[PDB]
Structures are given as C-alpha cells and as structure tokens.
C-alpha cells in the first residue's frame, strides 16, 4: 500500500471508474488520517495519499506533480488536504494548470492563513525563540539563559529546530531517534507554509472552514489566533467557496465534523462524474 511517497487508501479499478481523490499529508501525520473522509465519500471513489518530501512548498509540488501525471494523465484532477496538506494540494493545482491539465476540484480542509503575515525577519526570529523559551521555562520548570540569537538567525527553520534539539541532547539520557525526528520534521513542515509563494488560481477552490485554530497552533504561531473571512485565499482565488464546518482546526479531519465535509464533497464529486457522462 505504500509505494515511495504514494499511499493507496482505495485503489482505482483497472479501467475507467470514478475520478480518484488525491490527498496530501498534514504536518506530523501521514495520509491514514483521510480514512474517515474516505468513508463519507461515494462508494468506489479511489483515493491516493501523498506523503512527506523535502523542500519549499513549490519544490515539494515539483516532486508531486510528475507523479500525479503518471497516475492520472490529463485529468480530471481532484486535490484535497487538511492543514499543510491543503497548501500542498493548492500548489499541485497551480502546477498542473501551468501544464494545461484539467483541475476540477481543490478542497482545502481548514487550510486557513494566519490572520497577519508572518514576517521573515531577524526581529521575528528573536521574538519567536523568546516566546518558545518562556513556554519551556514554565512547562519544564527551568530557566533558559541568554539565547544565541546570531546563530539562530543565520539558519532556516530546519536548522534552527535542529540546533535547539541538538543542544538538549548533549546532556542527560539519549532521546530516541523517532521522537527527535518527528519533532524536527513536524516543525519544519509547518514552517514551510510561512514562505509559500501563493499563485493565483483560475478554478474553483472549496475551503472547509472551522471556527478557530486550536491552542497548540496558536502557541506555535500566535498569528493563528485571528482568521479572515476568506482564510487568506480571496486575493488569489476569485472563484472561492467557503463551507463553514465549526469546531477547531484539529477536529476538522475527524468524525463528526468530517461528515459535513464528506456530505459536501460527495455532491461536488457527483457533479463532476455527471459532467463526464
Ligand atoms: C493564501 O495564503 C495562505 C492560505 C492558507 C495558509 C494555511 N493553510 O493551512 C495552514 C495551516 O494549517 N497551518 C498550520 C501550521 N503551521 C497550522 C497549524 C499549526 C500548528 C499545529 C500543531 O498542532 N502543532 C504545532 C506543534 C503541534 C497544527 C496546525 N496555513 C497559508 C497561507 O499563506 C501563508
């Protein structure tokens, strides 16, 4: 069921059949999280999951788009994701369109921009790490000494989190490799969003919109405390539909909330299959 970065959640028939749904992984999870959604979609809808790759959002989409084409040719493309996965689906839709492929549905499952832009500055790096330090002092009941701001600010997001994790592991017990790896890659995958270069898109985007980010998101980046009516997509997408779903971001992928998403998506897929026949 895993072939490189492609997971088969439901294999398509050998010939013809329904348009597959391509889903994209969240930060810190795999595409197994789309199983509840799969169960709310029509029977026999194929679903393939794209798992983690390295690079900027644009570079990741450059790895995905050739594989999408190998599996599905000229289209129709249905592209869906929650959280980071929505940003990935969108970057793949832009990429496919540039190659003239037929993208008919882009489903963003609470892929909502921070309500203020995240500055890419030294001052923001300082502020971020001071925040994080303060959370570490309270949670672990320690004092953190002066932060080495020069060292952090010459690093990208991966380098900063690596340097901090490596400092922690110079002292005391050896932390299992799986735990360090998961923390490092979840952090950098979430930070890859901040510098996404969002390009306008000329087709229909559907944004399933929760009420708010959960608290851990807001601790990670306080600008997720506020959200705009268009989730930050309006200037880029003229043909934007918002489907309110309630709850918190973290709950959007799970039952019961995923049932509203699935009910809606099923109607959209129904329309797509009708337009083919
Ligand atoms: C058009 O402009 C944009 C539109 C949409 C977006 C966007 N779409 O999706 C997201 C998103 O979901 N960001 C996640 C992150 N980062 C949220 C999150 C954070 C933290 C956690 C968590 O639980 N943590 C931390 C450690 C345990 C979970 C989710 N942003 C971005 C845009 O431009 C930059």
UniProtKB/Swiss-Prot annotation:
<feature type="region of interest" description="Thioesterase-like">
    <location>
        <begin position="20"/>
        <end position="113"/>
    </location>
</feature>
<protein>
    <recommendedName>
        <fullName>Polyketide synthase Pks13</fullName>
    </recommendedName>
</protein>
<feature type="active site" description="For thioesterase-like activity">
    <location>
        <position position="83"/>
    </location>
</feature>
<comment type="function">
    <text>Involved in the biosynthesis of mycolic acids. Forms, with FadD32, the initiation module of the mycolic condensation system. Synthesizes, in coupled reaction with FadD32, the biosynthetic precursors of mycolic acids, alpha-alkyl beta-ketoacids, via the condensation of two long chain fatty acid derivatives, a very long meromycoloyl-AMP and a shorter 2-carboxyacyl-CoA. The acyl chain of the acyl-AMP produced by FadD32 is specifically transferred onto the N-terminal ACP domain of Pks13, and then transferred onto the KS domain.</text>
</comment>
């Amino acid at each position: 069921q895993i072939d490189g970065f492609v997971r088969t959640l439901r294999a398509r028939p050998e010939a013809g059949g329904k348009v597959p749904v391509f889903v994209f992984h969240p930060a810190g999870g795999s595409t197994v999280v789309y199983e509840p959604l799969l169960g709310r979609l029509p029977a026999d809808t194929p679903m393939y999951g794209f798992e983690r790759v390295e690079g900027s959002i644009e570079e990741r989409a450059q790895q995905y788009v050739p594989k999408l084409i190998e599996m599905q040719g000229d289209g129709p493309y249905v592209l869906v994701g929650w959280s980071l996965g929505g940003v990935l689906a969108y970057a793949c839709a832009i990429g496919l369109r540039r190659l003239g492929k037929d993208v008919r549905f882009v489903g963003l499952i609470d892929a909502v921009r921070a309500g203020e832009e995240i500055p890419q500055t030294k001052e923001e790096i300082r502020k971020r790490w001071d925040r994080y330090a303060a959370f570490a002092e309270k949670t672990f009941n320690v004092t953190i000494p002066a932060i080495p701001y020069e060292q952090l600010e010459e690093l990208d997001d991966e380098g900063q989190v690596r340097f901090v994790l490596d400092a922690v592991s110079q002292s005391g017990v050896q932390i299992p490799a799986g735990i360090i790896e998961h923390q490092r890659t979840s952090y950098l995958d979430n930070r890859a969003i901040d510098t996404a270069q969002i390009q306008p898109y000329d087709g229909h985007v559907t944004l399933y919109m929760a009420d708010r980010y959960h608290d851990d998101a807001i601790m990670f980046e306080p600008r997720y405390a506020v959200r705009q009516p268009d989730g930050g997509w309006g200037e880029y997408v003229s043909d934007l539909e918002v489907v309110p779903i309630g709850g918190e971001h973290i709950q959007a992928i799970d039952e019961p909330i995923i049932a509203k998403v699935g009910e809606h998506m099923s109607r959209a897929l129904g329309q797509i299959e009708a337009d083919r026949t």
